[PDB]
From Swiss-Prot, chain B:
Entry's free-text remark on domains: Dynein heavy chains probably consist of an N-terminal stem (which binds cargo and interacts with other dynein components), and the head or motor domain. The motor contains six tandemly-linked AAA domains in the head, which form a ring. A stalk-like structure (formed by two of the coiled coil domains) protrudes between AAA 4 and AAA 5 and terminates in a microtubule-binding site. A seventh domain may also contribute to this ring; it is not clear whether the N-terminus or the C-terminus forms this extra domain.
Name of the protein in question: Cytoplasmic dynein 1 heavy chain 1
Subunit comment: Homodimer. The cytoplasmic dynein 1 complex consists of two catalytic heavy chains (HCs) and a number of non-catalytic subunits presented by intermediate chains (ICs), light intermediate chains (LICs) and light chains (LCs); the composition seems to vary in respect to the IC, LIC and LC composition. The heavy chain homodimer serves as a scaffold for the probable homodimeric assembly of the respective non-catalytic subunits. The ICs and LICs bind directly to the HC dimer and dynein LCs assemble on the IC dimer. Interacts with DYNC1LI1; DYNC1LI1 and DYNC1LI2 bind mutually exclusive to DYNC1H1.
Localization per record: Cytoplasm, Cytoskeleton
Organism ancestry: Eukaryota, Metazoa, Chordata, Craniata, Vertebrata
Origin: domain of life: Eukaryota
Related illness: Charcot-Marie-Tooth disease, axonal, type 2O: An axonal form of Charcot-Marie-Tooth disease, a disorder of the peripheral nervous system, characterized by progressive weakness and atrophy, initially of the peroneal muscles and later of the distal muscles of the arms. Charcot-Marie-Tooth disease is classified in two main groups on the basis of electrophysiologic properties and histopathology: primary peripheral demyelinating neuropathies (designated CMT1 when they are dominantly inherited) and primary peripheral axonal neuropathies (CMT2). Cortical dysplasia, complex, with other brain malformations 13: An autosomal dominant disorder characterized by global developmental delay with impaired intellectual development. Some patients show signs of peripheral neuropathy, such as abnormal gait and hyporeflexia. CDCBM13 is associated with variable neuronal migration defects resulting in cortical malformations.
Protein's gene: DYNC1H1
From-to range in the entire protein, with total length: 3682 to 3862 of 4646
Function: Cytoplasmic dynein 1 acts as a motor for the intracellular retrograde motility of vesicles and organelles along microtubules. Dynein has ATPase activity; the force-producing power stroke is thought to occur on release of ADP. Plays a role in mitotic spindle assembly and metaphase plate congression.
Length: 172, 181
């Protein structure tokens, strides 16, 4: 909507220039504004391009968040590849250059995770993304123990508490 | 904490899983990133600039775009020649060319940063094999129980606080010394 308002704003500037012409200074202004509109239309072309490809990226990302939560890196990659191949078969435009670790995460959140002692592995990045965004309460399977440290560091400001099922004070 | 536990189907339905077990590829990539950030700090900053050409340079491009947009949104001086947005157009073209040349620099990353990754690639595979030898070491004796945090402690004590790296600055010699240590 912002881009389209600006798109008609360019035509308003064109109207102002036309009123001015009704002359070489205004002519130079007109031609450079035409180059400005050239930039506008190339931006809108690629911008409608990601409009066309937004659906497939969201589909793949959602399928990856909901599923693939137990499988290892190899099997997650295999499922993503099969999904992408099927989407290619169905002529559904999904952008490929993006990493699933980058679409669903922001730079500020990634930096906070790094400050929260998150191992820089991309698998751990996917796990962090899934922990951030979920519909069912996650079940963390961490034999290493790094995930617990990451959760405590991330949610320290909210005063996250540690407790175990064996503890009787769990219910309280 | 148990990674091999089996859960009833109801539990698998009510909750989503976030697997954190370390695999050969997982440890490989983790240690690759660890040595990338620890070693070649200038080239680590180069990889940080690889991240910056997406999170800042593209960000600067888009923010200068929107700043130009708002500046020409003012529409001050009706009739009068106030379309001096042209300098911001020149800056926008410079920013776009910078982002495209940064994409070309990422193409060079398919040549140079990938070289930094593959030079440490044998180290990552070797140390992953080391850790899983340590894990498989628990079979021959009940006392040979080593955690991943321990192996990461050795990894840090080798990368950092290493007396053998104080007098060495060349990347290849540092890599040989770091593998030996």
């Amino acid at each position: 909507m912002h881009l389209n308002v600006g798109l008609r704003k360019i035509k308003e500037t064109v109207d102002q220039v036309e009123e001015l012409r009704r002359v070489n200074r205004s002519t130079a202004l007109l031609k450079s504004l035409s180059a400005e509109r050239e930039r506008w239309e190339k931006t809108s072309e690629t911008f409608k391009n990601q409009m066309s490809t937004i659906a497939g990226d969201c589909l793949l990302s959602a399928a990856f968040i909901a599923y693939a939560g137990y499988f290892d890196q190899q099997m997650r990659q295999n499922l993503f590849t099969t999904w992408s191949h099927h989407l290619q078969q169905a002529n559904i435009q999904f952008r490929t250059d993006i990493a699933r670790t980058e679409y669903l995460s922001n730079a500020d959140e990634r930096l906070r995770w790094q400050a929260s002692s998150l191992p820089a592995d991309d698998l751990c990045t996917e796990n962090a993304i899934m922990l951030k965004r979920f519909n069912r309460y996650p079940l963390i399977i961490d034999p290493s123990g790094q995930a617990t440290e990451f959760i405590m560091n991330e949610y320290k400001d909210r005063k996250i508490t540690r407790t175990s099922f064996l503890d009787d004070a769990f219910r309280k | 904490r148990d990674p091999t536990v089996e859960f009833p189907p109801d539990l698998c339905s009510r909750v989503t899983f976030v697997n954190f077990t370390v695999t050969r590829s997982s440890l490989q990539s983790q240690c690759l990133n660890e040595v990338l950030k620890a070693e070649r700090p200038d080239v680590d900053e180069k990889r940080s600039d690889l991240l910056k050409l997406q999170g800042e340079f593209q960000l600067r491009l888009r923010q200068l775009e929107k700043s130009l947009l708002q500046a020409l949104n003012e529409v001050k001086g009706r009739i009068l020649d106030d379309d001096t947005i042209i300098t911001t157009l020149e800056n926008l073209k410079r920013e776009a060319a910078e982002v495209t040349r940064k994409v070309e620099e990422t193409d060079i990353v398919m040549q140079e940063v990938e070289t930094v990754s593959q030079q440490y690639l044998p180290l990552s595979t070797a140390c992953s094999s080391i850790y899983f030898t340590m894990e498989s070491l628990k079979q021959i004796h009940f006392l040979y129980q080593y955690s991943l945090q321990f192996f990461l402690d050795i990894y840090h004590n080798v990368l950092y606080e290493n007396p053998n790296l104080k007098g060495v600055t060349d990347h290849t010699q540092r890599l040989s010394i770091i593998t030996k240590d």
